[PDB]
Design a protein around this ligand. Structure first.
Ligand SMILES: CCCCCCCCCCCCCCCCCC(=O)OC[C@H](CO[C@@H]1O[C@H](CO[C@H]2O[C@H](CO)[C@H](O)[C@H](O)[C@H]2O)[C@H](O)[C@H](O)[C@H]1O)OC(=O)CCCCCCCCCCCCCCCCC
Ligand code: CLA
Ligand code: CLA
Ligand SMILES: CC(C)=CCC/C(C)=C/CC/C(C)=C/CC/C(C)=C/CC/C(C)=C/CC/C(C)=C/CC/C(C)=C/CC/C(C)=C/CC/C(C)=C/CC1=CC(=O)C(C)=C(C)C1=O
Ligand SMILES: CC(C)=CCC/C(C)=C\CC/C(C)=C/CC/C(C)=C/CC/C(C)=C/CC/C(C)=C/CC/C(C)=C/CC/C(C)=C/CC/C(C)=C/CC1=CC(=O)C(C)=C(C)C1=O
Ligand SMILES: CCCCCCCCCCCCCCCCCC(=O)OC[C@H](CO[C@@H]1O[C@H](CO)[C@H](O)[C@H](O)[C@H]1O)OC(=O)CCCCCCCCCCCCCCCCC
Ligand SMILES: CCCCCCCCCCCCCCCCCC(=O)OC[C@H](CO[C@@H]1O[C@H](CO)[C@H](O)[C@H](O)[C@H]1O)OC(=O)CCCCCCCCCCCCCCCCC
Ligand SMILES: CCCCCCCCCCCCCCCCCC(=O)OC[C@H](CO[C@@H]1O[C@H](CO)[C@H](O)[C@H](O)[C@H]1O)OC(=O)CCCCCCCCCCCCCCCCC
Ligand SMILES: CCCCCCCCCCCCCCCC(=O)OC[C@H](COP(=O)(O)OC[C@@H](O)CO)OC(=O)CCCCCCCCCCCCCCC
Ligand SMILES: CCCCCCCCCCCCCCCC(=O)OC[C@H](COP(=O)(O)OC[C@@H](O)CO)OC(=O)CCCCCCCCCCCCCCC
Ligand SMILES: CC1=C(/C=C/C(C)=C/C=C/C(C)=C/C=C/C=C(C)/C=C/C=C(C)/C=C/C2=C(C)CCCC2(C)C)C(C)(C)CCC1
Ligand code: OEX
Ligand SMILES: [Fe+2]
Lengths: 37, 334, 52, 38, 341, 30, 75, 66, 28, 34, 35, 42, 42, 38, 30
């Protein structure tokens, strides 16, 4: 609700999408590059 | 049959406990005299006029010192570069006052270390070894002769030589910083890279052998007892440690050759200390390191400070305080 | 007298008789085996294994 | 009491590792004495 | 089978650079510590924090450039880009010295992520993990100098800046103000660094000089195939050499190569303990028996009391320009000069 | 009185160097 | 594909004969157009000192440090 | 193998050894707690560092009641 | 594909060297 | 196909044009103390 | 002091002469290859 | 003036750990003489 | 005022001879465990 | 060297004689301490 | 400082009395 508290939760959301776009890209490519049995 | 041949057969015998050799004919008398005078001069030796201003600096244990502060003091500024043996001193009391035993220890040290180096050659000849361990030992011989011999020569006095002690070493390093700026000199830079690199590749090679040891013991006894001495089987999977470091950085940065690997461990430090010991040598003749003081200016022309200007103000503090009574004139030419 | 320009530091005459009797006392030992040998015997090696 | 422990082992120290551990203590005694006496 | 197994099989696949699980912590954080240093030494100045020039835009070469520590007014703030100091602005973040904590924090999570890399590769190859334990040595020097040393001090300002000459003043700042060379923890650290460089120069030069004849060529590097079971150098000869030269020698290759691990690493752990004791200003500054005697007897001089007068020159002369935040205005007449210098 | 301890540490260190060189456990093949 | 087989191929040097000068000149123009002084806030040689401020500028506040650097960079 | 009276009471606490829940189990419940406890440590550090300012929370030596 | 592995390190490096050659010709 | 030693030649003298350019601007421009 | 000095030049050129006449004593032939 | 508790620090810092390392060597040689079964086992 | 060399007299008069008598007992039990041949001889 | 000595023996000290010799030293340490501290 | 040594000698003496009574080498027939 302050300047410092509102900016921190926005960084927490921004810290979620940085983990997110790495994770979402990693699941999709792990489907295509599976190893033959 | 002759007396000389029965003496050459003994002095070059590898069947002795310690190989003596022909270099030991002048290694052992030199280093035992450098030793037996060092133990006496470190324990019981009166104070020494080092600055030549008749202000005697205590350096031994009986005159109130410890392991850290006690030191064999270098010879006087009054003597300087002159050879000062015992018989050219008219009493031992006049010898010990003016920095006597610093020249007796150092000159019998540099002869005994340059003979210990040739002795490492000689036994490699008589044992069938390829010869060049003594070339690797040239790197501390270069550095010992740089601070005890070459730096007193170019500065013109043994009083600028290195004090044989522990606190005397740091008196030597700091005064050498203010007067020569060794840290900016690229040969101290090339040997910090020699011993940081040397301690890297030591602990990097010693870990990859110890990582890939083969099972020869149980979990109760020691790891080291899986090596029987003189065995002919290889004691670690070298393909395993190659595949590890071949994935830890990348594939092409790994030595599969163990001979070229064990050569690079000998190259990197020794070349780093050859280059460094010729940093003290070229700074013995006042060819100092870099000097970037007042190098960055604005368009107005005012000096903008850098990190070298902060480093300069540390050098100016040691320069105006070293040998605080010995100077009389505005420039430390010595 | 330190900075005198005297040969091998030989200040007095007595120190010469020390030097000559040091090199010669071992030279005479050395000639007891390697002296009185044939000075005319060669080899086409890099290194000679002639005798004691 | 109860029975004898099957986890009894023996302790070893060869002559090599004696001289390491002696020299380790004396060199640490040389180094740290000057500071302790102050 | 599952979703976790497909991701586990993809990361551990043989490829050019091994990624693994630990590459998700290493490769983002190490790329930004390195790139944060190359940017900060090229573009970002130190004109507002220290009052220096530490960039390539400002004429500094490779030696006098640095990523510099922030101001003393910042204190120990983490200086987040979104934080209360920078407030989202990139340009004001760089001028306060925000890249330095950016380098140090993402660098500290690179050394975490690189040591986890050495546990992961050793488990897949199937070896003992002594590389990851010897690398804990350099972790204890980064943490206890770049992190634990400014935390005990007044702010991040008293930390080493990431530049070549900026380390060099930190070497000089630590002698005058702390007497770091007198500390027995540096003395046990120099014994490991110069002792570790000693061991690889000997083991380098003894293996290479007891080699066997495995070929007719004069080059001995050619005569080694990697998958051979015969040892390539005579251990019995090398023992017989050093037992007569030096008097005592290794008779155990397993003990030898372990001893090449113990000596360099312990010098980084023992020297790391002392620098934690200088965050608290618990320095080995004086021998009081030397100091009480030199006060009562104005003739007693050692080399040790000579080093204190060299430290008054470091404490007085550089501290005016060292700490511009404190505004030391020294007169000319308080600065300790010697005679005629 | 103080320097007597320093001397005993130094010559005591040189004792265990003497015993390590001459009374070493001599390694043997087989 | 082996690395040394790539850089000796012609098709490699077809692509990277355009991309390297188009990226090196963009690193030139990033400096010569005066853009790098404004992104990173580095002083030009004209503007270390000003007409008013003749001393060394320092930040002297924890929280208004952004506002104080708005002061010291206008003149 | 010596039955004691205190050993008889505690015996059902040690009688299980190595029974597991088959599968992934309550592992995704744990990570949501660990993600939460990571955010908790970040917040109370930034309060302490004065890099996260909360209204009517001042990190300074306060008058405890005497 | 390894085009993302090299060019994350080489595309910056040529860009900064485009700036370091420009700073040699900048004067006061 | 290009011979590999031609590649190391052209890139190798390209580095010398980069390095000696950096030692040039130690004596001119900024940081030269002129 | 001129009595000590005599004693040193004895001891120096005793061991220096053992060094000089050591390598003149067919010293390359003293190897483990042959003789 | 030196601290008189430093004599107790050094001389017990020498003797107590160094006499410890002697004991691990004496019982090592006793076990080797114990198994060997000749003239010294008892 | 006490004599500060008495701390060194007593605490080495305790420890040095008492640590001696411990060593003769440990090597006694090691020889007995050395001959016995089971689980501890090695 | 020469051959192995046939006069090698073994030293014994049972658990009984340990406690005698420990108590002998501590009681002599209790008795003579007060005089040494003076 | 002086009485600390006397106390350590007394309770140290009572330790070896404790170990001699309870950890005694129990004598056995045959
Ligand atoms: C091992 C492997 C490790 C792996 C590497 C991991 C790396 C992760 C990086 C760690 C991040 C740590 C930095 C956090 C910032 C910091 O520390 O920030 C420091 C702040 C403390 O803030 C400081 O607090 C001080 C105390 O002030 C207080 O007191 C003053 C006088 O009393 C005034 O009253 C003032 O108003 C009042 O606030 C001053 O105010 C300083 O200016 C202010 O910066 O604490 C904090 O955030 C947290 C401190 C509490 C946690 C303690 C652990 C961390 C500190 C360890 C060091 C302890 C010191 C020992 C030295 C050795
Ligand atoms: C995985 C790699 C990694 C790691 C470990 C870090 C670590 C760090 N970075 Mg960094 N960073 C990274 C990658 C990484 N970074 C990348 C790729 C970039 C480029 C964009 C940056 C850019 C960057 C900047 C610009 C800054 C940092 C900063 C920081 C530090 C503080 C950040 C903080 O407080 O976290 C807060 C965030 C978290 C604790 C994340 C927690 C996530 C929780 C568990 C889940 C959140 C879910 C959420 C509530 C719901 C989301 C919903 C949505 C997904 C739909 C910290 C050391 C700051 C710094 O060091 O200042 C000096 C800073 O200014 N980083
Ligand atoms: C004979 C001289 C000598 C020697 C051998 C040493 C030895 C040592 N000193 Mg010392 N010192 C000396 C003289 C000496 N000192 C003198 C005269 C002074 C002046 C008073 C000092 C002042 C001094 C200080 C002030 C400090 C030391 C420290 C140290 C230790 C070095 C720390 C280290 O290994 O860093 C090696 C570096 C690391 C381990 C950091 C980690 C390295 C990372 C992993 C590298 C990652 C790079 C990565 C690949 C990315 C690179 C690419 C990128 C660039 C693009 C070591 C014990 C330091 C210390 O004690 O620290 C504990 C320390 O702080 N010394
Ligand atoms: C798509 C989006 C979002 C856009 C953004 C773009 C983007 C994705 C960018 C990200 C890309 C990114 C930055 C990734 C790159 C990854 C990367 C490389 C990051 C790390 C950063 C970095 C600074 C790395 C460089 C540092 C590095 C690792 C250097 C390696 C050093 C090196 C080559 C050392 C070799 C030393 C050496 C010769 C050692 C051998 C000698 C030695 C004694 C070893 C011991 C030994 C060796 C053996 O061999 C064997 C046998 C045995 C017995 C043995 O004892
Ligand atoms: C007597 C007088 C008057 C003395 C006064 C002296 C004085 C002024 C003070 C000195 C006091 C003093 C000694 C202070 C030291 C204090 C100090 C620095 C303490 C260090 C203490 C310590 C705990 C340090 C921690 C770091 C540490 C563990 C370092 C150890 C360094 C060290 C011992 C390294 C060993 C070096 C060593 C000699 C190795 C070479 C081994 C060698 C013979 C190789 C043999 C060999 C090699 C092969 O490769 C192969 C293949 C074979 C087969 C083989 O055999
Ligand atoms: C394909 C992938 C390639 C991977 C690239 C990986 C990135 C790592 C590269 C690290 C380089 C870090 C060195 C920076 C040097 C710099 O740019 O100086 C560039 C500076 C810029 O030059 C300065 O420019 C200023 C402009 O105002 C002034 O004019 C100064 O006078 C002038 O010196 O040049 C120097 O300082 C001259 C000497 C350069 C010495 C550099 C070598 C020093 C040894 C470091 C070796 C690093 C090894 C890297 C191995 C890779
Ligand atoms: C087995 C070995 C047994 C010996 C142990 C050897 C340890 C030696 C080091 C400790 C003794 C040195 C103390 C100086 C001697 C002296 O006289 O002091 C004497 C001082 C006491 O000081 C005396 O006090 C008296 C009243 O209290 C009077 O005031 C005296 O004037 C005053 O001198 O004793 C100590 O300071 C003992 C402190 C020991 C505890 C150490 C605390 C610090 C530990 C930190 C741990 C960090 C470790 C991290 C890992 C590294
Ligand atoms: C293994 C054990 C190692 C410890 C040995 C234990 C022996 C302890 C008893 C001796 C120490 C007690 C001395 C008091 C301590 C003290 O501070 O003194 C300290 C005094 C020295 O006195 C100090 O001297 C200094 C300058 O010399 C200053 O003057 C000091 O002020 C002064 O106190 O030391 C002694 O007196 C040591 C004497 C030891 C020799 C004993 C001589 C008598 C022997 C007679 C033998 C008869 C035996 C017949 C059989 C019975
Ligand atoms: C500036 C960069 C530093 C030098 C750059 C190159 C490194 C040296 C490479 C050639 C080394 C020569 C070479 O490779 O020899 C390797 C040599 C064994 O070589 P081989 O006998 O197989 O063959 C070498 C010769 O015999 C000819 O084949 O190993 C040693 O004996 C190591 C023991 C000495 C250890 C210290 C060696 C330090 C010497 C290095 C100084 C050399 C300067 C001259 C260079 C020719
Ligand atoms: C005139 C020249 C004649 C030679 C001079 C003799 C001086 C030689 C010094 C003896 C080293 C004794 C240390 C025992 C060490 C000991 O006995 O180790 C014995 C050890 C033999 O290990 P092994 O392979 O037998 O061990 C296999 C397993 O049993 C491991 O336990 O040899 C080494 O590893 C020593 C190599 C490092 C040598 C460390 C030397 C450090 C230098 C000395 C530091 C003290 C100087 C303090 C002065 C104040
Ligand atoms: C900061 C930051 C960032 C960024 C990051 C990155 C992306 C970076 C990168 C960067 C990089 C990564 C950089 C690089 C650089 C490089 C360089 C610039 C190099 C140079 C080089 C040189 C100069 C060298 C030299 C040489 C040669 C060439 C050869 C011979 C040898 C020698 C060594 C001499 C971001 C966005 C996150 C945001 C936040 C902050
Ligand atoms: O004598 Mn020893 O230090 Ca070489 O600089 Mn000049 O001289 Mn003295 O002053 Mn500074
Ligand atoms: Fe090796």
């Amino acid at each position: 609700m302050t300047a410092s508290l509102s900016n921190f939760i926005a960084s927490l959301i921004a810290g979620g999408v940085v983990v997110g776009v790495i994770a979402i890209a990693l699941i999709v490519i792990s489907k295509s590059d599976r190893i033959l049995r | 049959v002759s007396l000389w041949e029965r003496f050459c057969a003994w002095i070059t015998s590898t069947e002795n406990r310690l190989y003596i050799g022909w270099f030991g004919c002048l290694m052992f008398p030199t280093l035992l005299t450098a030793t037996s005078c060092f133990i006496i001069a470190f324990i019981a030796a009166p104070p020494v006029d080092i600055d030549g201003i008749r202000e005697p600096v205590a350096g031994s244990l009986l005159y109130g010192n410890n392991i850290i502060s006690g030191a064999v003091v270098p010879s006087s500024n009054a003597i300087g570069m002159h050879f000062y043996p015992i018989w050219e001193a008219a009493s031992i009391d006049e010898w010990l006052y003016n920095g006597g035993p610093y020249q007796l220890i150092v000159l019998h040290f540099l002869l005994g270390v340059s003979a210990y180096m040739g002795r490492e050659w000689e036994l490699s000849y008589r044992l069938g070894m390829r010869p060049w361990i003594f070339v690797a030992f040239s790197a501390p011989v270069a550095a010992a002769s740089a601070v005890f011999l070459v730096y007193p020569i170019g500065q013109g006095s043994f009083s600028d030589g290195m004090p044989l002690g522990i606190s005397g070493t740091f008196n030597f390093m700091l005064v050498f910083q203010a007067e020569h700026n060794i840290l900016m000199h690229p040969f101290h830079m090339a040997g910090v890279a020699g011993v940081f690199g040397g301690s890297l590749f030591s602990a990097m090679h010693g870990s990859l052998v110890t990582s890939s040891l083969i099972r020869e013991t149980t979990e109760n006894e020691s790891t080291n007892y899986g090596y029987k001495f003189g065995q002919e089987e290889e004691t670690y999977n070298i393909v395993a440690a190659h595949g590890y470091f071949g994935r830890l950085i990348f594939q092409y940065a790994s030595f599969n050759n163990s001979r070229a690997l064990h050569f690079f461990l000998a190259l990197w430090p020794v070349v780093g200390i050859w280059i460094t010991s010729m940093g003290i040598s070229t700074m013995a003749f006042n060819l100092n390191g870099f000097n970037f003081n007042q190098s960055v200016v604005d368009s107005q022309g005012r000096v903008i400070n850098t990190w070298a200007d902060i480093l300069n103000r540390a050098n100016l503090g040691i320069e105006v305080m070293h040998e605080r009574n010995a100077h009389n004139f505005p420039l430390d030419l010595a | 007298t330190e900075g005198t320009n005297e040969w091998f530091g030989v200040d007095d005459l007595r120190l010469l008789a020390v030097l000559f009797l040091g090199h010669w006392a071992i030279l005479s030992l050395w000639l007891g085996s390697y002296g009185d040998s044939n000075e005319d015997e060669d080899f086409f090696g890099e290194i000679d294994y002639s005798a004691r | 009491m109860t029975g004898p422990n099957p986890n009894k082992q023996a302790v070893e120290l060869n002559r090599t590792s004696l001289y390491w551990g002696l020299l380790l203590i004396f060199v640490l005694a040389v180094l740290f004495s000057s500071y302790f006496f102050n | 089978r599952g979703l976790f197994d497909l991701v586990d099989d993809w990361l551990k696949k043989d490829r050019f650079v091994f990624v693994g699980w630990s590459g998700l912590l290493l490769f983002p954080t190490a790329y930004l510590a390195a790139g944060g240093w190359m940017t900060g030494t090229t573009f970002v100045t130190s004109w507002y924090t220290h009052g220096l020039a530490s960039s390539y835009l400002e004429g500094c070469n490779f030696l006098t450039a640095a990523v510099s520590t922030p101001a003393n007014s910042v204190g120990h703030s983490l200086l987040l880009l979104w934080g209360p100091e920078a407030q989202g602005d990139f340009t004001r973040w760089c001028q306060i010295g925000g890249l330095w904590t950016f380098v140090a924090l993402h660098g500290a999570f690179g050394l975490i992520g690189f040591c986890l890399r050495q546990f992961e590769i050793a488990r897949l190859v199937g070896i003992r993990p002594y590389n990851a334990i010897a690398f804990s040595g350099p972790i204890a020097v980064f943490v206890s100098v770049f992190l634990l040393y400014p935390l005990g001090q007044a702010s991040w300002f008293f930390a080493p800046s990431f530049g070549v000459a900026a380390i060099f003043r930190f070497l000089l700042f630590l002698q005058g103000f702390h007497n770091w060379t007198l500390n027995p923890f540096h003395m046990m650290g120099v014994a490991g660094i110069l002792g570790g460089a000693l061991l690889c120069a000997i083991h380098g030069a003894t293996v290479e000089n007891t080699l066997f004849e495995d070929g007719d060529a004069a080059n001995t590097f050619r005569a080694f195939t990697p998958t051979q079971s015969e040892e390539t150098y005579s251990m019995v000869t090398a023992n017989r050499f050093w037992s007569q030269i030096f008097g005592v020698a290794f008779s155990n290759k397993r003990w030898l190569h372990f001893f090449m691990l113990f000596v360099p690493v312990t010098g980084l752990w023992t020297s790391s303990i002392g620098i934690v004791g200088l965050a608290l200003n618990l320095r080995a500054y004086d021998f009081v028996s030397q100091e009480l005697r030199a006060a009562e007897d104005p003739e007693f001089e050692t080399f040790y009391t000579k080093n204190h007068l060299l430290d008054e020159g470091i404490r007085a002369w550089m501290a005016a320009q060292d700490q511009p935040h404190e505004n030391f205005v020294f007169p000319e007449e308080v600065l300790p000069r010697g005679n005629a210098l | 009185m103080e320097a007597l301890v320093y001397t005993f540490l130094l010559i005591g260190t040189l004792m265990v160097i003497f015993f390590a060189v001459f009374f070493r456990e001599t390694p043997r093949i087989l | 594909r082996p690395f040394s087989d790539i850089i000796t191929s012609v098709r490699y040097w077809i692509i990277h004969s355009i991309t390297i000068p188009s990226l090196f000149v963009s690193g030139w123009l990033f400096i010569s157009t005066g853009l790098a002084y404004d992104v990173f806030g580095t002083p030009r040689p004209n503007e270390y000192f000003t007409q008013d401020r003749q001393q060394v500028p320092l930040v002297n506040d924890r929280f208004s440090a952004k506002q104080e650097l708005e002061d010291l960079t206008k003149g | 193998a010596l039955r004691t009276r205190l050993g008889e009471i505690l015996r059902p606490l040690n009688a299980e050894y190595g029974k597991v829940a088959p599968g992934w189990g309550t592992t995704p419940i744990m990570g949501i707690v660990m993600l939460a406890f990571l955010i908790f440590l970040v917040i109370i550090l930034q309060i302490y560092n004065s890099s996260l300012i909360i209204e009517n929370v001042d990190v300074d030596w306060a008058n405890g009641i005497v | 594909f390894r085009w993302l592995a090299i060019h994350g390190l080489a595309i910056p490096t040529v860009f900064f060297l485009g700036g370091i050659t420009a700073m040699q010709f900048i004067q006061r | 196909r290009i011979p590999l030693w031609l590649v190391g030649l052209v890139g190798g003298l390209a580095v010398i044009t980069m390095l000696s350019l950096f030692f040039y601007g130690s004596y001119s421009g900024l940081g030269s103390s002129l | 002091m001129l009595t000590l000095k005599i004693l040193v030049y004895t001891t120096v050129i005793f061991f220096v002469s053992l060094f000089i006449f050591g390598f003149l004593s067919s010293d390359p032939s003293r190897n483990p290859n042959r003789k | 003036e030196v601290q008189f508790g430093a004599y107790l620090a050094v001389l017990l810092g020498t003797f107590l750990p160094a006499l410890f390392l002697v004991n691990l060597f004496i019982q090592t040689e006793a076990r080797k003489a114990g198994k060997a079964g000749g003239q010294d086992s008892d």
